[PDB]
Amino acid sequence: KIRTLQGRVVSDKMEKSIVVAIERFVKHPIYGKFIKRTTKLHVHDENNECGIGDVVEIRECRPLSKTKSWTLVRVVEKAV
């Protein structure tokens, strides 16, 4: 029962860190079309378990760096 977001891993080059694009399917204010907007997030991950293109679940936490305030909770569908 914790607020946690899913998303793909856009990059994992920087160590103990990943960047996770979180898609959100928002309705447009005016035109009422539903757009897929995207939110990149720098997420912390000890052990460097995540690969690129990997779906991953993440939660909000105290800030671990300048840009980094989210930590991953589990990985899913790591196929290449």
Binding site: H28, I30, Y31, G32, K33, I35
Partner: peptide
């Protein structure tokens, strides 16, 4: 087109 509008509004 709605899409067009979204891309580049009025």
């Amino acid at each position: 087109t709605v899409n067009q509008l979204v891309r580049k509004p009025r």
